[PDB]
Amino acid sequence: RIQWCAVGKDEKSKCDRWSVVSNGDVECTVVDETKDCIIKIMKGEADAVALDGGLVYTAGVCGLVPVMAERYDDESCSKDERPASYFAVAVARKDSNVNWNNLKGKKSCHTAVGRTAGWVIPMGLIHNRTGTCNFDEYFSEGCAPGSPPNSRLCQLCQGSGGIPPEKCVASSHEKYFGYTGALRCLVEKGDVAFIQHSTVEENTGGKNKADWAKNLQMDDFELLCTDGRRANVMDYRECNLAEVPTHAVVVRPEKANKIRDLLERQEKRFGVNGSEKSKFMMFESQNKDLLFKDLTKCLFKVREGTTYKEFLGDKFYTVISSLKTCNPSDILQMCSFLEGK
Numbered sequence: 001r002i003q004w005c006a007v008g009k010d011e012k013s014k015c016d017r018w019s020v021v022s023n024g025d026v027e028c029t030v031v032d033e034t035k036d037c038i039i040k041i042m043k044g045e046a047d048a049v050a051l052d053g054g055l056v057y058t059a060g061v062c063g064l065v066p067v068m069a070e071r072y073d074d075e076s077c078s079k080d081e082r083p084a085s086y087f088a089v090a091v092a093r094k095d096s097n098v099n100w101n102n103l104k105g106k107k108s109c110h111t112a113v114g115r116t117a118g119w120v121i122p123m124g125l126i127h128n129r130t131g132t133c134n135f136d137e138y139f140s141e142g143c144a145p146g147s148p149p150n151s152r153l154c155q156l157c158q159g160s161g162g163i164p165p166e167k168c169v170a171s172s173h174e175k176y177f178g179y180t181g182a183l184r185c186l187v188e189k190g191d192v193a194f195i196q197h198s199t200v201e202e203n204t205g206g207k208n209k210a211d212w213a214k215n216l217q218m219d220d221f222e223l224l225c226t227d228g229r230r231a232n233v234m235d236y237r238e239c240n241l242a243e244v245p246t247h248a249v250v251v252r253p254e255k256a257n258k259i260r261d262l263l264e265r266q267e268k269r270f271g272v273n274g275s276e277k278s279k280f281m282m283f284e285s286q287n288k289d290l291l292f293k294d295l296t297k298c299l300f301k302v303r304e305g306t307t308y309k310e311f312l313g314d315k316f317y318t319v320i321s322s323l324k325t326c327n328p329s330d331i332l333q334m335c336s337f338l339e340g341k
């Protein structure tokens with residue numbers, strides 16, 4: 001009695017496992033893209049789906065509200081404080097003299113296009129304070145995996161180094177792909193790197209035995225605050241682009257209370273402390289984040305009547321709506337049209 005929206009064959013597989021062990025309590029709806037899930041839950045042929053901030057924003061505009069959210073810290077959940085996932089931070093080289101004010105024309109390092117930390121928040125922020133939607137021409141050059149092969153945002157990207165170069169590919173083949181990759185891009189070619197708060201740490205002091213990251217220390221980097229002031233890598237709390245919320249399960253409002261109880265029921269058997277976690281573990285997928293982030297310990301209940309605006313938080317909400325004002329998706333446009341806004 002809960003059609004879950006699975007995206008891709010891998011999630012579908014896991015969703016089938018879940019459907020089986022839950023004794024049909026959970027059914028599965030497979031789609032190609034995550035955005036496809038929003039429509040299917042609207043048409044009632046899907047009940048729930050875990051989304052990231054950007055999609056949550058879209059879902060909300062379409063009238064779908066967050067009902068439960070993942071917690072990545074302690075296994076044990078519902079005690080009223082919306083957990084934070086991480087902080088989106090802009091990093092720069094210590095020995096450089098660049099900052100948020102003279103950022104135009106510099107070289108950037110993004111985790112990948114469409115990503116929350118490396119793209120949505122930064123470009124979302126630049127559009128808000130600048131009014132531009134010309135992201136590809138803001139920076140002189142830069143590496144943003146997933147960008148058009150021949151565009152400034154690909155010039156800084158390296159490839160795999162192998163035969164088929166694969167420059168700018170949104171995959172591990174691209175050296176500058178992901179968080180660790182964006183940092184490396186800053187260390188080797190870029191001016192600024194848009195990653196998360198824990199990135200610099202995870203790759204300094206020798207944690208990363210790689211060559212480019214063997215003699216790197218935290219002091220080699222600084223955070224660029226939106227003031228124009230720079231901060232110590234450890235002060236991300238006082239100098240972050242935005243606080244990113246955890247992924248939220250979104251559903252049609254009238255099925256809100258219904259879905260919670262059924263998911264709680266599911267946690268009780270397949271959660272981290274599931275009575276049956278031995279058969280199937282909801283939050284387990286071999287670090288592949290199938291259905292839920294494997295970093296999930298439990299689902300926290302989002303207060304009833306909580307809209308997407310409240311859940312995302314003003315700052316994040318502002319940057320998302322900001323970014324989306326620039327070439328919005330068909331769904332977002334369709335939903336905004338359907339209403340008054």
Ligand SMILES: CC(=O)N[C@@H]1[C@@H](O)[C@H](O)[C@@H](CO)O[C@H]1O
Pocket residue numbers: 125128129226315318319
């Ligand atoms: C506090 C304030 O008024 N600023 C907001 C905030 O979303 C962000 O800090 C800024 C970008 O620098 O854009 C403005 O909309």
